[PDB]
Structure formats: structure tokens, C-alpha cells
Scaffold this motif. Structure first.
Motif, PDB file in Angstrom:
ATOM      1  N   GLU A  82      -3.481 -27.428 -13.594  1.00 43.90           N
ATOM      2  CA  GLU A  82      -3.480 -25.974 -13.715  1.00 43.90           C
ATOM      3  C   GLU A  82      -4.711 -25.529 -14.504  1.00 43.90           C
ATOM      4  O   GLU A  82      -5.179 -26.257 -15.370  1.00 43.90           O
ATOM      5  CB  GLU A  82      -2.245 -25.525 -14.505  1.00 43.90           C
ATOM      6  N   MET A 136      -5.275 -26.166 -18.417  1.00 44.63           N
ATOM      7  CA  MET A 136      -4.363 -27.249 -18.753  1.00 44.63           C
ATOM      8  C   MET A 136      -4.958 -28.291 -19.702  1.00 44.63           C
ATOM      9  O   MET A 136      -4.238 -28.865 -20.529  1.00 44.63           O
ATOM     10  CB  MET A 136      -3.902 -27.954 -17.474  1.00 44.63           C
ATOM     11  N   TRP A 181     -10.030 -29.507 -23.203  1.00 46.03           N
ATOM     12  CA  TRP A 181     -10.873 -30.509 -23.846  1.00 46.03           C
ATOM     13  C   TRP A 181     -11.559 -31.443 -22.842  1.00 46.03           C
ATOM     14  O   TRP A 181     -12.395 -32.263 -23.246  1.00 46.03           O
ATOM     15  CB  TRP A 181     -10.060 -31.386 -24.819  1.00 46.03           C
ATOM     16  N   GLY A 208       7.571 -46.723 -23.274  1.00 47.36           N
ATOM     17  CA  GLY A 208       8.464 -45.734 -22.712  1.00 47.36           C
ATOM     18  C   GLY A 208       8.027 -44.289 -22.924  1.00 47.36           C
ATOM     19  O   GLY A 208       8.257 -43.452 -22.056  1.00 47.36           O
ATOM     20  N   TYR A 209       7.409 -43.987 -24.061  1.00 52.89           N
ATOM     21  CA  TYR A 209       6.876 -42.641 -24.282  1.00 52.89           C
ATOM     22  C   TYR A 209       5.758 -42.351 -23.287  1.00 52.89           C
ATOM     23  O   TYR A 209       4.887 -43.204 -23.050  1.00 52.89           O
ATOM     24  CB  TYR A 209       6.383 -42.458 -25.721  1.00 52.89           C
ATOM     25  N   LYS A 210       5.776 -41.157 -22.699  1.00 58.58           N
ATOM     26  CA  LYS A 210       4.753 -40.800 -21.716  1.00 58.58           C
ATOM     27  C   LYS A 210       3.553 -40.053 -22.294  1.00 58.58           C
ATOM     28  O   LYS A 210       3.690 -39.199 -23.176  1.00 58.58           O
ATOM     29  CB  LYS A 210       5.352 -39.976 -20.580  1.00 58.58           C
ATOM     30  N   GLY A 211       2.378 -40.380 -21.778  1.00 59.47           N
ATOM     31  CA  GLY A 211       1.190 -39.599 -22.033  1.00 59.47           C
ATOM     32  C   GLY A 211       0.627 -39.052 -20.730  1.00 59.47           C
ATOM     33  O   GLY A 211       1.161 -39.291 -19.657  1.00 59.47           O
ATOM     34  N   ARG A 212      -0.474 -38.326 -20.831  1.00 61.75           N
ATOM     35  CA  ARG A 212      -1.061 -37.636 -19.703  1.00 61.75           C
ATOM     36  C   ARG A 212      -2.545 -37.996 -19.575  1.00 61.75           C
ATOM     37  O   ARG A 212      -3.294 -37.962 -20.579  1.00 61.75           O
ATOM     38  CB  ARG A 212      -0.919 -36.128 -19.917  1.00 61.75           C
ATOM     39  N   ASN A 222       1.104 -38.149 -15.436  1.00 60.61           N
ATOM     40  CA  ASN A 222       1.765 -38.571 -16.669  1.00 60.61           C
ATOM     41  C   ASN A 222       2.322 -39.962 -16.530  1.00 60.61           C
ATOM     42  O   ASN A 222       3.021 -40.250 -15.558  1.00 60.61           O
ATOM     43  CB  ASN A 222       2.918 -37.626 -17.005  1.00 60.61           C
ATOM     44  N   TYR A 281       3.610 -47.173 -14.494  1.00 61.43           N
ATOM     45  CA  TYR A 281       4.941 -47.556 -14.083  1.00 61.43           C
ATOM     46  C   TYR A 281       4.980 -49.015 -13.653  1.00 61.43           C
ATOM     47  O   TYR A 281       4.015 -49.534 -13.094  1.00 61.43           O
ATOM     48  CB  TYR A 281       5.426 -46.650 -12.962  1.00 61.43           C
ATOM     49  N   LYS A 286       8.040 -45.095  -9.221  1.00 64.78           N
ATOM     50  CA  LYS A 286       7.074 -43.997  -9.339  1.00 64.78           C
ATOM     51  C   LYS A 286       5.707 -44.650  -9.477  1.00 64.78           C
ATOM     52  O   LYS A 286       5.630 -45.794  -9.903  1.00 64.78           O
ATOM     53  CB  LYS A 286       7.358 -43.151 -10.572  1.00 64.78           C
ATOM     54  N   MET A 316      -1.070 -37.171 -25.689  1.00 68.12           N
ATOM     55  CA  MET A 316       0.356 -36.924 -25.845  1.00 68.12           C
ATOM     56  C   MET A 316       0.569 -35.609 -26.601  1.00 68.12           C
ATOM     57  O   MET A 316      -0.273 -35.213 -27.393  1.00 68.12           O
ATOM     58  CB  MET A 316       1.029 -38.101 -26.570  1.00 68.12           C
ATOM     59  N   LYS A 317       1.677 -34.924 -26.346  1.00 67.62           N
ATOM     60  CA  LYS A 317       1.990 -33.717 -27.114  1.00 67.62           C
ATOM     61  C   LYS A 317       3.005 -34.061 -28.203  1.00 67.62           C
ATOM     62  O   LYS A 317       4.075 -34.584 -27.916  1.00 67.62           O
ATOM     63  CB  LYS A 317       2.525 -32.611 -26.198  1.00 67.62           C
ATOM     64  N   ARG A 366       1.229 -29.812 -30.982  1.00 69.07           N
ATOM     65  CA  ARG A 366      -0.183 -30.008 -30.723  1.00 69.07           C
ATOM     66  C   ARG A 366      -0.457 -31.172 -29.791  1.00 69.07           C
ATOM     67  O   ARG A 366       0.276 -32.164 -29.793  1.00 69.07           O
ATOM     68  CB  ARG A 366      -0.924 -30.288 -32.024  1.00 69.07           C
ATOM     69  N   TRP A 367      -1.564 -31.073 -29.060  1.00 66.25           N
ATOM     70  CA  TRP A 367      -2.034 -32.176 -28.217  1.00 66.25           C
ATOM     71  C   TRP A 367      -2.934 -33.174 -28.951  1.00 66.25           C
ATOM     72  O   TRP A 367      -3.912 -32.802 -29.594  1.00 66.25           O
ATOM     73  CB  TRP A 367      -2.756 -31.631 -26.990  1.00 66.25           C
TER      74      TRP A 367
END
Ligand SMILES: Cc1cnc(NCC(F)(F)c2ccccc2)c(=O)n1CC(=O)NCCONC(=N)N
Lengths: 11, 26, 249
Positions: free
Chosen positions: C8, C11, C14, C133-137, C156, C182, C188, C203-204, C210-211
């Protein structure tokens, strides 16, 4: 493929 | 100092389409 | 990015594009961490096995972009480099250990709706978020398959347990790396790919909204192969080198 950027920047 | 807060999202309190997926995995 | 989606607008304000002067082409991603500093992968600038050895005057950074190829008049800012810093112990001979570089812009860039620096993590943030297990982007304009997207892509991905990262490859893994993606049975997909290098893995934080940039797109075997994972430079582990370079120069 890439649109030309302003000439000055390539300077 | 203002890092990581997006003008078009956090700053307006709007969420992007998939940020939920991140917060949920936490 | 493979199996991602169109970002987006706004989005990832940075997100930075490293752009080659001549020929004019996409080198890598990178990230804006202040008005004057850009963070990217060392292998984007220096990789002798492929005769890659770029200097300040070979490159431009393009900040604020969405479209891969248009010149986004009135939106993007294009900057020149004053200096490039590569981690002194960057291991290009073996496993891309310490795959990191800083770039100092000639002049500060003005922040806008489309341009805004990401945070660097502190020890507590890292300890809290950097977990299997924690997701980042991950974001980039790189290859769609192991053809090229018209706009910035996003995906992600979960952080993967260290032993599983080790057991997926012959490459020697170090503490300065983590892997993400994955597993083959999770049904996925997604990975970074060529041209995504040097981009930010973010990560947020749930504690302050914050990012944070946790990783830098580093390396992989192919892109999105089952049983393989993306590797990322571990930003916080190298943060001392980052602080050292910045307030010295
Ligand atoms: C510079 C470079 C060289 N080799 C790449 N992959 C092959 C390898 F895994 F066998 C290897 C060889 C030497 C050192 C480390 C790994 C490699 O990936 N790079 C960087 C580059 O191609 N990265 C693009 C983003 O790729 N990362 C993903 N596939 N997620």
C-alpha cells in the motif's frame, strides 16, 4: 526499462 | 525520535491490510 | 519477493532503492534510519566473486518510491552518496557473515508522507520480538520467481528456530544471522529473492506501536524452495558497529 531520471542527478 | 511511526498509518491511527497478522503471531 | 502482495502507498516509508547510474538499473533495497543515513547489505556493494565493487559515485539512492520503474515526480527524492562504510569483518569469502553496510547521504532528506525512518532495535526490544514463530515483514522490488513487479511487494514471514535453520543448509550459520520463512508443511509460502538484497526485515512492537528493523535481507539458496529459508543480517547484534560509525562520522 526504467524511466529516465532528471539529467542533473546522473551528473 | 519519531522513528517507525508512519505518517499515513500510525500517525492517523489507520492500520494497513496485514499488520494484524504480525501482532497476532506475538 | 516471491508470493508477496503489492504494498500500500505509505506502507514502508523507510524503504530505499539503490539505483545504478550506468547502466541505469536496480541494485538492491536499503532502509532509511535517519535524515542522513541508509542501511543496506554489504554484498550489495562488495562481492568480489561476482566482480562487484561499487563506490560512492556509481550509485544513487531513491527514497519514497512505490513504482519500480517510473520517476515518481514530486514524490520520490533521489540522493547522492558522500560515503560508504562496509563492516570491517564482513565475510564475503565464506558465508556472508556480518552482511551490513552504512551509507551517508550528501545532504539530509526531508521527511514526508512517503519518507520516514524506521527504528533500530534496543536490547529489550530485540529480546522480546526475536522469537521463533513471531512474524516480520519483508519488502522489495526484486524478482517474483526464482518476472519483475510493477510496484513495491510485501510479504510477512515467521522467524524460524535456529536448529532448523542450521539443518537446512551446508552453509556455516553464525550468531549474526537468523533465518525466516514457512516450513514445507505449513502450506503457506514466500521469500525474498534477487534484487531484494539489503532490504529491511521489520517487526511492529506491541508495546509502543513502532516499527523496528530487526534484519537485513541477506542470502538464500534459490528463492522460496521448500525446506530452505531466507537468511537475514541480525541488526541488533551489529548495532555497536552501527553506533560507532555514526557518531564518529
Ligand atoms: C551474494 C550471494 C551469493 N550467493 C547466494 N546464495 C548461494 C549460497 F547460498 F550458496 C551462498 C553462497 C555464498 C555465501 C552465502 C550463501 C546469495 O544469496 N547471495 C546474496 C543474494 O543472492 N541474496 C538475494 C536475497 O536472497 N535471499 C533469499 N533467497 N531469501
Amino acid at each position: 526499462d526504467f524511466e529516465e531520471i532528471p539529467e542533473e542527478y546522473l551528473q | 525520535a519519531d522513528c517507525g511511526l508512519r505518517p499515513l498509518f500510525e500517525k492517523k491511527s489507520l492500520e494497513d491490510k496485514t499488520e494484524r497478522e504480525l501482532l497476532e503471531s506475538y | 519477493i516471491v508470493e508477496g502482495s503489492d504494498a500500500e502507498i505509505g506502507m514502508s516509508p523507510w524503504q530505499v532503492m539503490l539505483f545504478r547510474k550506468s547502466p541505469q538499473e536496480l541494485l538492491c533495497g536499503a532502509s532509511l534510519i535517519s535524515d542522513r543515513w541508509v542501511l543496506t547489505a554489504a554484498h550489495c556493494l562488495l562481492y568480489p566473486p561476482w566482480d562487484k565493487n561499487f563506490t560512492e559515485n556509481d550509485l544513487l539512492v531513491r527514497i519514497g518510491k512505490h513504482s519500480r520503474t517510473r520517476y515518481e515526480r514530486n514524490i520520490e527524492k533521489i540522493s547522492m552518496l558522500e560515503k560508504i562504510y562496509i563492516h570491517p569483518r564482513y565475510n564475503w569469502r565464506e558465508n556472508l557473515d556480518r552482511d551490513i553496510a552504512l551509507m551517508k547521504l550528501k545532504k539530509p532528506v526531508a521527511f514526508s508522507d512517503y519518507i520516514h525512518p524506521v527504528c533500530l532495535p534496543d536490547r529489550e526490544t530485540a529480546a522480546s520480538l526475536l522469537q521463533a514463530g513471531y512474524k516480520g515483514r519483508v519488502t522489495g522490488w526484486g524478482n517474483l520467481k526464482e518476472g519483475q513487479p510493477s510496484v513495491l511487494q510485501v510479504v510477512n514471514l515467521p522467524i524460524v528456530e535456529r536448529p532448523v535453520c542450521k539443518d537446512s543448509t551446508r552453509i556455516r550459520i553464525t550468531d549474526n544471522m537468523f533465518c525466516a520463512g514457512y516450513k514445507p508443511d505449513e502450506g503457506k509460502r514466500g521469500d525474498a529473492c534477487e534484487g531484494d538484497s539489503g532490504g529491511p526485515f521489520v517487526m511492529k512492537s506491541p508495546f509502543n506501536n513502532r516499527w523496528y528493523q530487526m534484519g537485513i535481507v541477506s542470502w538464500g539458496e534459490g528463492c522460496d524452495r521448500d525446506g530452505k529459508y531466507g537468511f537475514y543480517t541480525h541488526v541488533f547484534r551489529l548495532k555497536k558497529w552501527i553506533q560507532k560509525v555514526i557518531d564518529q562520522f
